[PDB]
Amino acid sequence: SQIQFTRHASDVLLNLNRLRSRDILTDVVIVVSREQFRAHKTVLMACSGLFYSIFTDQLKRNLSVINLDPEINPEGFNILLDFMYTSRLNLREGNIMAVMATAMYLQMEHVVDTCRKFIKAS
Amino acid sequence: SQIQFTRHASDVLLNLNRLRSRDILTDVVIVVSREQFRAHKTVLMACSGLFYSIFTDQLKRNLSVINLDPEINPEGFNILLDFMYTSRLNLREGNIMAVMATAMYLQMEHVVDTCRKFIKAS
Ligand SMILES: Cn1cc(C#CCn2cnc3c(c(/C=C/S(N)(=O)=O)cn3CC(=O)Nc3ccncc3Cl)c2=O)cn1
Ligand SMILES: Cn1cc(C#CCn2cnc3c(c(/C=C/S(N)(=O)=O)cn3CC(=O)Nc3ccncc3Cl)c2=O)cn1
Ligand SMILES: [Cl-]
Ligand SMILES: [Cl-]
């Protein structure tokens, strides 16, 4: 029935990423060892079972700082956060294992499955 | 270079819409005459020049209630808000003029242009 705008979802995500680049309406800092990364909780929830579980919980929804497991690699996390905001996943032989283990921790099954495909094709 | 996830932007927007349906992390009420509609400021900014201009402004960024022009038709606004969260625009002969005038007010040029195409094809 309704008219479908094929580029609209991509346009929305690009503009969310532009807001993240300007720190506009970002509402959380994710701390990963010595690094930290600002984001929108809504985008994190949309992209991660871990962040969904954290922020749906009424005890945690209002947190402004989330400390990740100190074993998580900041580069693997940064790669996945950039994927969340762009639809683009930079998998390479040098980062595949860190990215895949981080995607398991963040509960991102389709990314984990793509990492398995990458390993199988290598 | 990077791996492109074709469904990712659509997945993000669907999950933002699911959060809006549960009123999770919505941060504004838009008042349109006797009706009101909750939303995420980030999605409104991504989809509307009017909301972009309102919430980028440091005097207005923290507002939790925005009163629209009392001449705006609530049904036309609801149609456009649903489009923002779905990529689907329900244009019909009975609503085209209200939708098009509302899209002008919200500063949504590609929607206005699609409304002109609808008129031309009618
Ligand atoms: C150890 N291990 C665990 C897993 C897993 C898992 C399941 N699992 C749960 N949750 C997910 C995802 C994705 C995938 C993204 S991706 N990048 O893979 O395509 C996003 N989310 C959040 C989500 O569904 N959010 C909402 C749902 C309904 N309503 C509102 C919202 Cl916000 C997701 O895989 C993988 N390994
Ligand atoms: C009287 N009259 C005025 C107009 C107009 C206009 C221009 N105009 C300005 N702004 C827009 C749009 C759209 C279109 C959406 S749509 N539905 O038409 O495709 C979205 N936005 C917001 C936006 O660009 N936001 C960001 C930009 C950069 N960085 C971060 C963000 Cl959040 C947009 O058309 C039409 N009639
Ligand atoms: Cl802000
Ligand atoms: Cl909330």
Short mmCIF file of N, CA and C and ligand atoms in Angstrom, two decimals, chain A residues 23-26, chain B residues 61-62, ligand 3:
data_model
loop_
_atom_site.label_atom_id
_atom_site.label_comp_id
_atom_site.label_asym_id
_atom_site.label_seq_id
_atom_site.Cartn_x
_atom_site.Cartn_y
_atom_site.Cartn_z
N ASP A 23 28.88 15.16 18.76
CA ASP A 23 28.49 14.91 20.16
C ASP A 23 27.13 15.54 20.47
N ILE A 24 26.23 15.57 19.49
CA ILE A 24 24.89 16.14 19.71
C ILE A 24 23.94 15.04 20.17
N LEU A 25 23.41 15.21 21.39
CA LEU A 25 22.41 14.36 22.04
C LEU A 25 22.98 12.97 22.35
N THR A 26 24.28 12.80 22.26
CA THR A 26 24.88 11.58 22.82
C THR A 26 24.60 11.57 24.32
N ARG B 61 17.74 22.95 22.73
CA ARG B 61 18.12 21.53 22.64
C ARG B 61 17.47 20.72 23.78
N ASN B 62 17.39 21.29 24.98
CA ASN B 62 16.92 20.57 26.19
C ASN B 62 15.40 20.63 26.38
CL CL C 3 23.77 17.48 23.59
#
